[PDB]
Write an enzyme that holds these catalytic residues in place. Structure first.
Site, mmCIF file in Angstrom:
data_model
loop_
_atom_site.group_PDB
_atom_site.id
_atom_site.type_symbol
_atom_site.label_atom_id
_atom_site.label_comp_id
_atom_site.label_asym_id
_atom_site.label_seq_id
_atom_site.Cartn_x
_atom_site.Cartn_y
_atom_site.Cartn_z
ATOM 1 N N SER A 1 1.989 0.530 -2.895
ATOM 2 C CA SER A 1 1.115 1.620 -1.939
ATOM 3 C C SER A 1 -0.163 1.971 -2.688
ATOM 4 C CB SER A 1 1.716 2.763 -1.428
ATOM 5 O OG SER A 1 2.712 2.307 -0.457
ATOM 6 N N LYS B 1 -2.219 0.246 5.536
ATOM 7 C CA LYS B 1 -2.837 -0.859 4.634
ATOM 8 C C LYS B 1 -2.263 -2.185 5.468
ATOM 9 C CE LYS B 1 -2.176 1.600 0.159
ATOM 10 N NZ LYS B 1 -1.803 2.776 0.837
ATOM 11 N N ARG C 1 13.381 7.265 4.255
ATOM 12 C CA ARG C 1 13.040 6.338 5.457
ATOM 13 C C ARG C 1 13.638 5.134 5.426
ATOM 14 N NH1 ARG C 1 7.209 6.234 2.313
ATOM 15 N NH2 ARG C 1 8.956 5.877 0.588
ATOM 16 N N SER D 1 -0.108 5.347 4.298
ATOM 17 C CA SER D 1 -0.201 3.848 3.701
ATOM 18 C C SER D 1 0.302 3.050 4.813
ATOM 19 C CB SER D 1 0.710 3.920 2.700
ATOM 20 O OG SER D 1 0.323 4.911 1.485
#
Ligand SMILES: [Cl-]
Length: 242
Positions: free
Chosen positions: A95, A50, A227, A47
């Site tokens: 997402s 994007k 993350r 993602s």
């Protein structure tokens, strides 16, 4: 110049994880990472794609602006936030893969390929299905390559209009307070081994910008919050954020 700081490895091992954080100090033009090899290893963007996908969709007029509504196709998916109408802002925030799959179909293979080469994006290889190549096709990008691409975006130097770049940077807004602004995008790559999580973007300060790109092993979705958490622990250690 590049410096390897293996002390950041503690932030991964303390969470029984493995990964890389790459930082770039824009003022000083200096980079920092815990693992020079992994900083340059190429993974599926998932993602994080994007960001370029949004830019291309806007510049070609596939997306008119950040208010245009992409209606839910009425197919129930397992991510509840996807079973709703979206605009560019909310589609980035949640997402929303199926919205971006339709963007890619409308962009088409030829224009997508030409634009990724103009962006110097990763290995620039869209081999695979036009509506899934960033998840299970041939495209790959490293953390250092993410930073090079994001620096161009920050400076409006990509080969799309200034307007397209401003809209995508608006859509990347993740956090803001009196101390910093973070513009960023998460990724989660599971279809091709090794499964990883991404977080790429930058931190705006009053007097500097710190670009960052991290990826980490993600054997299950249980660790996705790491993350951002590991990245911020590194930023705190380096006194970039309080
Ligand atoms: Cl903004």
């Amino acid at each position: 110049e590049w410096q390897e700081n293996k002390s950041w490895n503690a932030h991964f091992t303390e969470h029984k994880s493995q990964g890389v954080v790459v930082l770039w100090n824009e003022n000083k033009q200096q980079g920092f990472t815990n693992n020079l090899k992994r900083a340059n290893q190429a993974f599926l963007p998932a993602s994080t794609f994007k960001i370029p996908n949004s830019l291309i969709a806007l510049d070609l007029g596939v997306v008119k602006d950040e208010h245009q509504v992409f209606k839910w196709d009425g197919q129930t998916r397992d991510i509840a936030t996807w079973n709703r109408d979206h605009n560019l802002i909310t589609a980035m925030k949640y997402s929303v893969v199926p919205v971006y799959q339709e963007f890619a179909r409308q962009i088409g293979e030829a224009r997508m390929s030409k634009m990724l080469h103009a962006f110097d994006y990763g290995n620039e290889d869209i081999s695979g299905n036009v509506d899934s190549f960033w998840l299970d096709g041939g495209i790959r990008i490293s953390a250092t390559e993410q930073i090079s691409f994001l620096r161009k975006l920050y400076h409006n130097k990509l080969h799309v209009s200034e307007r397209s770049q401003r809209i995508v940077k608006q859509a990347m807004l993740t956090e803001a307070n009196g101390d910093y602004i973070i513009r960023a995008k998460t990724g989660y790559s599971t279809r091709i081994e090794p499964k990883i999580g991404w977080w790429v973007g930058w931190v705006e300060l009053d007097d500097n910008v710190w670009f960052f790109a991290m990826n980490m092993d993600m054997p299950t979705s249980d660790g996705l919050g790491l993350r951002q958490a590991i990245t911020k622990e590194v930023l705190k250690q380096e006194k970039i954020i309080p």
